[PDB]
Structures are given as C-alpha cells and as structure tokens.
C-alpha cells in the first residue's frame, strides 16, 4: 500500500482508537474534533498561501476521519446518528477546503478562470454527495463516479501541495488539479443521477 | 393558475423532468450572467421567476397521473445547483467589485450552509432518521438573499446596505439551522441504537459508521 494511504492508515487505527477510547473520547466527539481541526487548517493556511502545509493538514484529517468507525467497532457498534454526523462533517470540511483555496486564488492570484473552476469544484463537491443521500432517502441508489471522494480530494490537494512544494514548487499544478477535478466532478454528477434513474422503482408514477 | 400552464407545456411534449432541468438551467444562467455584472435587481427577479416556474413540474406531474421518485431526486438536486449558482453569482460581484471582505466570508458561509442544511435532511432520511425543521429552509433562504440583493439595486430608490444585511442575517440563521437539524437527527427514533459495523474492502477491515 502507499505509505500515506487510508489503506496504510487502517493498519494503525486500532491502537489509536483504543487509546482515544481509554482517554474517554467517543467516536462522535472525535469526528467533530477532527472536522474542526481540518476546517481550522484549511481556513488558516490556504488563505495565507501556505498551500503545501494546508494540503498536508487536510490530508492528515482525511486519514483521521477513519478513527470514528474504528472506535465504534471497539465499542461494539456505530450509530445512524454517527453516520449522519460523519457525512455532514465531511461536507463542511470539503466546503472549507475549497473556500480556503478560493480565498487564495481570488485575492492573491491573477487567474479568474481558476476562480470559476474552484467554484465548480466547491458546488459539485456538495452536489455529488447530495445526490447519493437524497436518492437513498427515496429508496433509490445514487452512488457512481469513476473517482471516489478520497481520490477527488487527492487531486486538488496534490495540485495545491505541488504548487507550493518545498524547494522545487511547480505553481501550475494548482490550476491543473482544480480543472481536472472540475471536469471529473461534473461528470460524476451526471453519472450519479443516471444511477438514480436506473434504480429499482425510480420511474414508476405514483399518487 | 398552474393547471393551464402545465397542460400547455405537456401538449408541447415537455415532461416534468425536462421542465425541472430547463428551469434550473435558466435560473443558473440568470444568476451567473446578471449577478457578476452587478445587475442584482434584474438577477433577483429572474431567479424568483424561475422559482415560481419550478412549481410547474409538480402541476405537470399531477396532470400526468403522478410524479416519480427519480423526478423528486432530480428536482431536489437541481434546487441545490440553483442555490449554489445564486451565491456564486453574488460572491463574484461582492468579491471583485466591492470592498467588503467580511461580506465575502458571509457569502461563503451562506453558499456552504445552503448545501449542508439540505444535506442533513436528506442524509438523515437515508438512514431512516429525520433532519427537518430549523430556521432556514429554501423559501426563507431565497426571500432573504434575493430581497437584500434586489433592494440593494432597486430601481430609482436603491438601498445598497440591504445586500449585506440579508447575507449576514442568512449566514447566522443558516449556521444555527445546521445545529438545529443535527439535534433533530440525534432525537430521531433509533438514531443511537447500536449497530454492528461490518468491515468493508477486500480485507473487510475498513470500518465506517
Ligand atoms: C513528501 C510527502 C508528500 C509526497 C506526496 C506528494 C505531496 C503532495 C502534497 C501534499 C499531500 C496531499 C495529498 C496526499 C495524497 C496521498 C494519497 C495517496 O497516497 O493515495 C492513497 C489513497 O488513500 C487512495 O489512492
Ligand atoms: C450594513 C451592515 C450589515 C452588517 C450585518 C451584520 C449584522 C446582521 C444581523 C445579524 C448577524 C450578526 C453577526 C454579524 C457578524 C458580521 C460582522 C461584520 O464583519 O460586518 C461587516 C459587514 O460585511 C459590513 O458590510
Ligand atoms: C455549521 C457549519 C458551518 C461551517 C462552515 C465553514 C465552512 C467555511 C465557510 C466559510 C468560511 C470561508 C472563509 C474563507 C477564509 C477567509 C480567511 C481570511 O483571510 O479572512 C480575511 C479577513 O476578513 C480580512 O478582512
Ligand atoms: C501563522 C500561520 C500558522 C497558523 C497555523 C495554524 C493552522 C491550524 C492547524 C489546525 C490543526
Ligand atoms: C464573469 C464570470 C462570472 C462567473 C460566475 C461564477 C461562476 C461560478 C461557477 C460555479 C457555478 C455554480 C453552479 C455549478 C453548476 C454545476 C452543474 C452540475 C451538473 C449537474
Ligand atoms: C476556524 C473555524 C472553525 C470553525 C469550526 C467548524 C465546526 C465544524 C464542526 C461542526 C459539527 C456540528 C456539531 C453539532 C452537533 C449537534 C448535535 C446536538 C445533539 C446532541
Ligand atoms: Mn469518520
Ligand atoms: Mn468521513
Ligand atoms: Mn462516507
Ligand atoms: Mn463517502
Ligand atoms: Mn419543481
Ligand atoms: Mn425544486
Ligand atoms: Mn423542506
């Protein structure tokens, strides 16, 4: 496995989770703390141009995201509230990532098309997840997309981080990552709506 | 009022879902063309017009013997996109043509919370819980932001501060609403019943609530 991957991190979530339980933390409190730290990092570092440090901080709390489930597993189970909270917190965290980067791009760069791309990523990031939740609320399916949420985050965070990379930065990488993610995200939206359409019971007329 | 319009659109060969998509595309085009140019009154009228137009898909579905679950999901998703475009369009004017960086922050809070408020409800329902209620739903959201924007640019007698009053009011009310709806999730029947967490992945050790 890649050394910074979630699959790698899953090899040490059990001792971490046991430690956090021992200290009296719960899964849901950990979800909130990690989300708050992630938002703080994105909204502090990105608007300052510290894109490599921000990307590292955000990626850490993508890994940290995995602790609430590991903790709940050690405690005998999770809850539906915990699942809703995790998902909701992920929406907020993603929103802060794009808002932080947006602040840097809008006010400290000269790339207005890139602002547009960042806004597309921001809105599609929410909508991609909304389609799936809203579909399931109606008893339909709404997943889909060639590229999953963690990998979508990898695209933009890699672009940001390389653009600000220590010693040997490649500034174009931020724009490359954002436009690639914008295109991928728009497509993912259409693909997910197609999954809704092909779900059992999706097009029966009622009432 | 709606029935004759709906029947006419059905005779054209339009369906509820096509009307949803068209109304949303027009609303998005209005917000993203008129708000970035500072035509906030015109943009607000265009957006409100297509809000009223979004009610026609339901009137049409009635005339057709009923709507579909897919149509409901599509309509709700389109509503998110339309709300996104409203705040993006205004953001562009505020960010690049005003000197009010705090207002940019308020606008971004509105942008994100407009999505998250709806998301909490849908995601709660996807788990058999509830996430409804709260101060800000879409009608209150649009009234506040579009009234502030329209008044700020009103013909003859504008009141420029209205844009900022509306955005800050909506920002604060929308954060509160997110907290309210998550409490509603928590109090929902079954929300904290313990559930077995099966491992996901090829190794069945990826654990998620
Ligand atoms: C020197 C250490 C950094 C070297 C690496 C380039 C750094 C790019 C900049 C910031 C990292 C933010 C993104 C980190 C993404 C890692 C994603 C990954 O490892 O892939 C596994 C994933 O869980 C499934 O694909
Ligand atoms: C024209 C002034 C309108 C300002 C409306 C603020 C109050 C609105 C009501 C409740 C929100 C209270 C929270 C206020 C937090 C905002 C503080 C701020 O920074 O105000 C700067 C403003 O953008 C300058 O137009
Ligand atoms: C309860 C859920 C709500 C949580 C929603 C949070 C998501 C982030 C949204 C808006 C903040 C975006 C702020 C962008 C960063 C601004 C940094 C900055 O430099 O501020 C400039 C200063 O005001 C100079 O006047
Ligand atoms: C001077 C800028 C440095 C601020 C770093 C704080 C970032 C917060 C990280 C959250 C953990
Ligand atoms: C002068 C330039 C004006 C730019 C206006 C701001 C552009 C914001 C771009 C994001 C638009 C938000 C709506 C996204 C629509 C995505 C549709 C998803 C497909 C289902
Ligand atoms: C520097 C910016 C810091 C912003 C903090 C962002 C906070 C994100 C986490 C929000 C999580 C919502 C928690 C509310 C839970 C409500 C449950 C009540 C029922 C008991
Ligand atoms: Mn988690
Ligand atoms: Mn998560
Ligand atoms: Mn998830
Ligand atoms: Mn996910
Ligand atoms: Mn409608
Ligand atoms: Mn609608
Ligand atoms: Mn509602």
Numbering used by the authors:
A (entry chain A): 4 to 210
B (entry chain B): 15 to 223
Manuscript text:
One such potential target is the mycobacterial phosphatidylinositol phosphate synthase (M. tuberculosis PgsA1). 1 D-myo-inositol-3-phosphate+CDP-DAG→PIP+CMP 2 PIP→PI+Pi PgsA1 belongs to the class I CDP-alcohol phosphotransferases (CDP-APs), integral membrane proteins that catalyze the formation of a phosphodiester bond to merge a CDP-alcohol and a second alcohol, releasing cytidine monophosphate (CMP).
To unambiguously assign the metal-binding geometry we also determined the structure of the Mn2+—substituted protein to 1.88 Å resolution, allowing X-ray anomalous dispersion identification of the metal binding positions. The Mn2+ substituted crystals diffracted to 1.88 Å and belonged to space group P212121 with one homodimer per asymmetric unit as for the apo structure. As expected, our metal-substituted structure reveals a di-nuclear metal binding site coordinated by D68, D71, D89, and D93 of the conserved sequence motif, as indicated by two clear peaks within a metal coordinating distance to the chelating carboxylate side chains. In chain B of the M. tuberculosis PgsA1 homodimer, however, the anomalous difference density, corresponding to the aspartate-chelated Mn-ions, is extended indicating two alternate binding positions for the metal ion in site 2 (indicated as 2a and 2b in Fig. 1d, e). Besides the anticipated protein-bound metal ions, additional anomalous difference density peaks were found: two in chain A and one in chain B. These additional Mn-ions appeared to be coordinated by serendipitously bound citrate molecules, most likely derived from the crystallization condition. Two citrate molecules are chelating two Mn-ions in chain A and one citrate molecule is found chelating one Mn ion in chain B. The citrate-Mn complex is most likely not biologically relevant and result from the presence of 100 mM citrate and 120 mM Mn2+ in the crystallization solution.
